[PDB]
Ligand binder design. Sequence first.
Ligand SMILES: Oc1ccc(OCCc2ccccc2)cc1
Length: 162
Amino acid sequence: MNIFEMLRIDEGLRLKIYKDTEGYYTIGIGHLLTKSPSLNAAKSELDKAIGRNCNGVITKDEAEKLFNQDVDAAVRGILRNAKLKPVYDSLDAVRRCAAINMVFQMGETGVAGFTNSLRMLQQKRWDEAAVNLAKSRWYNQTPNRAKRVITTFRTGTWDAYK
Ligand SMILES: Oc1ccc(OCCc2ccccc2)cc1
């Protein structure tokens, strides 16, 4: 188990443009294309991301390459964020995967709201952090995925993905 396998489970794999749980155009392994309601806008973003005229359809290799870029962008975003980096660096490898998973899903807009969760995680107050993480729109809107991520933070094991 690693971050790629974890997010592949949580996001699935689809080779044609689809909509995420919020209704936004997405492709591949959870690659957001646009929040615009315009399918043409999504198709432009796709062609820009892949470097060819895709017509809304990609190959598995292309989906996996976008996925690698997206995971790396999440990691680098954590490392560049003065609030997230100290917490990330305090975690073991399995819990770091849970952190990347959340940033992959929510980006930087969730940083402020998760201030108290981040403190509890840095303090290694795992049960309290798990309770706090569930008091969120994130948990209420995607509860099964959030429960898996939270269990990973609570236990430091892959039990929720096995
Ligand atoms: O959009 C978000 C949502 C939640 C966040 O924090 C919780 C997960 C985490 C833990 C350690 C290091 C980085 C991230 C950060 C951004």
